[PDB]
Amino acid sequence: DWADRLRPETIAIRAGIHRTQEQEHSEAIFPTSSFVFDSAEEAADRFAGRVPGNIYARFTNPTVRTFEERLAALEGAEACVATASGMAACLTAFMGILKAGDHVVASRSIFGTTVQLLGNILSRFGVETSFVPLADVPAWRAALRPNTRMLFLETPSNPLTEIGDMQALADLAHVHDAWLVVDNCFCTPALQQPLKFGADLVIHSATKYLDGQGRTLGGAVCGSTELLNSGPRNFVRTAGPSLSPFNAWVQLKGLETLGLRMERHCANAQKIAEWLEARPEVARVYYPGLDSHPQQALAARQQRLPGAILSFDLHGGQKAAWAFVDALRLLSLTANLGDAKTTITHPASTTHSRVSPEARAAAGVGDGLLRISVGLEHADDLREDMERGFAALV
Amino acid sequence: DWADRLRPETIAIRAGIHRTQEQEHSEAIFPTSSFVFDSAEEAADRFAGRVPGNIYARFTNPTVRTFEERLAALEGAEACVATASGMAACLTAFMGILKAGDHVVASRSIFGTTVQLLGNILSRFGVETSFVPLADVPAWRAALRPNTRMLFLETPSNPLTEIGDMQALADLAHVHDAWLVVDNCFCTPALQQPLKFGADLVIHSATKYLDGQGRTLGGAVCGSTELLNSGPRNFVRTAGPSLSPFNAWVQLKGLETLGLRMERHCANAQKIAEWLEARPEVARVYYPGLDSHPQQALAARQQRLPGAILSFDLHGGQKAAWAFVDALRLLSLTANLGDAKTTITHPASTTHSRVSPEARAAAGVGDGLLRISVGLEHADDLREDMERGFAALVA
């Protein structure tokens, strides 16, 4: 009825709520592993699926249910299943959908731990993977195989904020009877809804922006009721990468402010990116809100706002990048994104250090590259701290 | 040096503690997903592994680390890695150790969800599984294949409390270059240490007795440093079934009273098992501390105490069992165990409901069987509540 027309800001504050008879205004935490039945008959019916209800927290927990329904509603998805972490959501998408003998085409720039999940762990269980540049649709098509069942990507990419053509890759996958799976950590549903571009599964790390304050690990898989009931849900219940009720409670409350946080995140990012581009010490800035971004138009087509993650190359390579960060007094030196606290990191020596120089050169992750997750502090304070980093180059 | 001679009760209260400079008496909760480096150089060194330190919560969290070290010390293991649930601990042992083309021999009576994880999930990823009766060592040997890499079991079993000869199965596995993996939820490290009988990995559900009070989900895999470093730890780090620090904090605190709780648990169960066996309405009782248990001696060799889970057959079938539980006002009707709250469930219609009646009959899980996880309430009150169930058998 009336609830179908609610704007996303209202949905993030109100959806998923099933108040108990105590009529608690705020969402309750249910730290319980099992649930009590009124009778043997009720227990048998619930176990047989003849009546709905709670049986075991690995299957159903009310606090986790509130988070799942709220996040699904923000993505426009029919259903959502929560997971212990973002990586576990990737694991749920892969192992709930694929099987030994299947093949995956994945963007080469996805989360390094995801690359290792496909290439070092799932490969030992009969899943083959081919890695292609994100923006090269012909390279995607050329990598397809008869046994290709999934195309997996993040957009925007990390750390260069490269863009993927979601609708083109959805069409490409669906023609070949394969699923499109998009990892939506960069933008969150406040900015991008991959389902509106033909994606079949949307993957989230609640760890980053849904929490938004660096407190907890969590993940989720969003999609149609039918797709999630064809193995992803069963995987979470059976293999048990489940989300704690405490973490769910933190994250579902985090969703309530996602929209207004991303607006400030992105506004601060826009100022910093442009100011960075005019600095003599900076060779290039990677941010989807710059005219200099080669895919600015595709990004604006898919996203309400450019995002809040940028990277930039400074002249002087690694020596300059290390001197720059070592002079900072405000920004966090940490390998994380999606926090109110602005973070900065040097990917070539931390997150891309096990990669080969030629592979980094092919991707474009140079030794003078710094990645900033732009937080919510005052841009003036962020600007002045970065000026300390630039002063260190003199 | 001195800490080596500490008794388990002391270990459960003091092991794994690394106080911060705040000198907090009680263990802190670290809800953080990442960690801050002092310099670019320290960040590079920590990512390369040149220096020790915290990087990301999915593989290093101080609260989780306290739980792992404490539980490991209670199992006599070198190492432990925590998981989001007991099932995720099973997932970690299987996927951390196996690969496509490996074969598993598993006790037929293991946790029903574990049966599904092996038989329905990992089967689709190249892992073959055969299921054998727990106590039948010859059946274990016959199910061996050239590609068998793991033997998996629980002992005591659920719900019949059947016993697996850990040492004999360890020897069987090791002669054939396979690992023995034992799920130790029934007894906990306070009663049984499968490493002392040749197990290679010990699997735990922190959900059951380590928590002890029905609050949280969690799991753990215990074993040698070398074996956990051969894939289980990387799996948790990379596939991410990690344990929340909130849950780890609950569970590490639960460990502090594990021995005292199991002693009252087992004392209650022994009284109730003997009282049940003498009732006219009861055809059979399954409890390792009973003289009638066909493996009492094997159970007493492997366990400090019998345990606190029992089942019993009622004269009559499902109707008698359902009339029995429906009259209870104290025991919890729930499919769970390891709580201070005593639980009861009817496996034929709940936990073994999706097993065919013919297969349950083969396993000995009848329609008159009820399973009790004996809690910490006063046994008299538990006894008087069960007398209400027996009185309901009159009409």
φ, ψ for residue A311, nearest 5 deg: -130, 155
Contact present, B353 and A48 (Cβ < 8 Å): yes
Residue A222 pairs in a beta bridge with: A80, A202
Contact present, B181 and B203 (Cβ < 8 Å): yes
Q: What SS3 state is found at B276? A: helix
Rounded distance between C-alpha atoms, residue B337 and residue A240, angstroms: 17
Contact present, A118 and A98 (Cβ < 8 Å): no
Rounded distance between C-alpha atoms, residue B207 and residue B218, angstroms: 5
Q: What SS3 state is found at B162? A: coil
Report which residue type is found at A30.
F
The count of residues in chain B is 395
Report which residue type is found at B101.
G
Contact present, A108 and A132 (Cβ < 8 Å): yes
Rounded distance between C-alpha atoms, residue A378 and residue A382, angstroms: 6
Rounded distance between C-alpha atoms, residue B13 and residue B33, angstroms: 27
Rounded distance between C-alpha atoms, residue B237 and residue B204, angstroms: 18
Q: Positive or negative, the Cα torsion across B26, B32, B34, B35?
A: negative
Instruction: Copy the structure tokens of residue A108.
Output: 């080469």
Residue B381 pairs in a beta bridge with: none
Instruction: Copy the structure tokens of residue B311.
Output: 């089942």
Residues 6+ apart with CB under 8 A from A108: A115, A131, A132, A133, A134, A363
Contact present, A179 and B19 (Cβ < 8 Å): no
Cis before A133 (ω within 30): no
Side by side, the strands of the sheet bearing A282-286 are: A282-286, A309-314, A369-373, A343-345, A332-333
Nearest to B306 by CA among B255, B265, B344, B336: B265
Burial of A146 (0-12, 13-18, 19+ CB in 10 A): exposed
CATH architecture of A258-391: Alpha-Beta Complex (3.90)
Rounded distance between C-alpha atoms, residue B15 and residue B68, angstroms: 10
Question: Could A333 and B40 be called an inter-chain contact, meaning their C-beta atoms sit closer than 8 Å?
Answer: yes
User: Which residues does chain A break after (C to N > 2.5 Å)?
Assistant: none
Nearest to B191 by CA among B287, B107, B301: B301
Tell me chain A's radius of gyration from C-alpha atoms.
22
Question: Could A244 and B126 be called an inter-chain contact, meaning their C-beta atoms sit closer than 8 Å?
Answer: no
Residues of A in contact with B349 (CB under 8 A): 40, 43-44, 47-48
Nearest to B157 by CA among B292, B261, B303, B267: B303
Rounded distance between C-alpha atoms, residue B228 and residue A223, angstroms: 35
Contact present, A83 and A77 (Cβ < 8 Å): no
Contact present, A178 and A150 (Cβ < 8 Å): yes
Nearest to A370 by CA among A303, A292, A300, A281: A281
Nearest residue in chain A measured CA to CA from B347: A44
Burial of A145 (0-12, 13-18, 19+ CB in 10 A): middle
Question: Could B241 and A349 be called an inter-chain contact, meaning their C-beta atoms sit closer than 8 Å?
Answer: no
Question: Tokens 């085409």 identify what position?
Answer: A105
Question: End-to-end alpha-carbon separation of chain A, Å?
Answer: 64
Question: In chain A, what are the domain boundaries?
Answer: 2-30+61-255, 258-391
Rounded distance between C-alpha atoms, residue B179 and residue B230, angstroms: 13
Q: How many CB pairs under 8 A join A and B?
A: 237
Rounded distance between C-alpha atoms, residue B321 and residue A32, angstroms: 26
Nearest to A387 by CA among A313, A314, A301, A279: A279
Q: Positive or negative, the Cα torsion across B245, B249, B250, B255?
A: positive
Instruction: Copy the structure tokens of residue A49.
Output: 């699926």
Segment holding B395, helix H or strand E: none
Number of neighbours of residue A349 by Cβ within 10 angstroms: 19
Rounded distance between C-alpha atoms, residue B118 and residue B112, angstroms: 10
Rounded distance between C-alpha atoms, residue A19 and residue B223, angstroms: 44
Rounded distance between C-alpha atoms, residue A42 and residue A49, angstroms: 10
Rounded distance between C-alpha atoms, residue A139 and residue B336, angstroms: 52
Please report the resolution in angstroms: 2.3
Torsion angle in degrees (nearest 10) through CA of B7, B9, B10, B11 = 80
- The 3-state secondary structure of chain A reads CHHHHCCHHHHHHHCCCCCCCCCCCCCCCCCCCECCCCCHHHHHHHHHCCCCCCCECCCCCHHHHHHHHHHHHHHCCCEEEEECCHHHHHHHHHHHHCCCCCEEEEECCCCHHHHHHHHHHHHHHCCEEEEECCCCHHHHHHHCCCCEEEEEEECCCCCCCCCCCHHHHHHHHHHCCCEEEEECCCCCCCCCCHHHHCCCEEEEEHHHHHCCCCCCCCEEEEECHHHHCCCHHHHHHHHCCCCCHHHHHHHHHHHCCHHHHHHHHHHHHHHHHHHHHCCCCEEEEECCCCCCCCCHHHHHHHCCCCCCEEEEEECCHHHHHHHHHHCCCCCEECCCCCCCCCEEECCCCCCCCCCCHHHHHHHCCCCCEEEEECCCCCHHHHHHHHHHHHHCCC
Residues 6+ apart with CB under 8 A from B351: A47, B112, B159, B335, B345
Q: Positive or negative, the Cα torsion across A136, A138, A144, A150?
A: positive
Report which residue type is found at A11.
I
φ, ψ for residue B201, nearest 5 deg: -130, 145
Interface test with A, best of B60, B67, B95, B125 (most A CBs within 10 A): B125
Instruction: Copy the structure tokens of residue B78.
Output: 């070198």
E strand intervals along chain B: 79-83, 103-107, 128-132, 148-154, 179-183, 201-205, 219-223, 282-286, 309-314, 332-333, 343-345, 369-373
CATH of domain B2-30+61-255: 3.40.640.10
Nearest to A90 by CA among A23, A209, A181, A5: A181
Segment holding B289, helix H or strand E: none
Residues of B in contact with A237 (CB under 8 A): 113
Side by side, the strands of the sheet bearing B309-314 are: B282-286, B309-314, B369-373, B343-345, B332-333
Contact present, A181 and A227 (Cβ < 8 Å): no
Nearest residue in chain B measured CA to CA from A38: B333
Question: Tokens 């199992």 identify what position?
Answer: B75
Q: Smallest Cβ distance to A353: which of B34, B48, B217?
A: B48
Contact present, B63 and B178 (Cβ < 8 Å): no
Number of neighbours of residue A21 by Cβ within 10 angstroms: 5
Q: Positive or negative, the Cα torsion across B165, B171, B173, B174?
A: positive
Nearest to B340 by CA among B391, B268, B236: B268
Contact present, B373 and B309 (Cβ < 8 Å): yes
User: Which residues does chain B break after (C to N > 2.5 Å)?
Assistant: none
Pairing relation of β-strands A369-373 and A343-345? antiparallel
Residue A333 pairs in a beta bridge with: A344
Report which residue type is found at B387.
E
Nearest to A89 by CA among A69, A72, A65, A114: A114
C-alpha distances (whole Å) from A135 to each of A305, A311, B229 are 19, 18, 37
Burial of A154 (0-12, 13-18, 19+ CB in 10 A): buried
Question: Could B33 and A207 be called an inter-chain contact, meaning their C-beta atoms sit closer than 8 Å?
Answer: yes
Q: List b or e across A355-385, with b for residues whose CB sees 16 or more CB atoms inside 10 angstroms.
A: beeeebeebbbbbbbbbbbbbbbebeebeeb
Q: Smallest Cβ distance to B91: which of A83, A113, A240?
A: A240
| CA A213 to chain centroid | 15
Contact present, A382 and A370 (Cβ < 8 Å): no
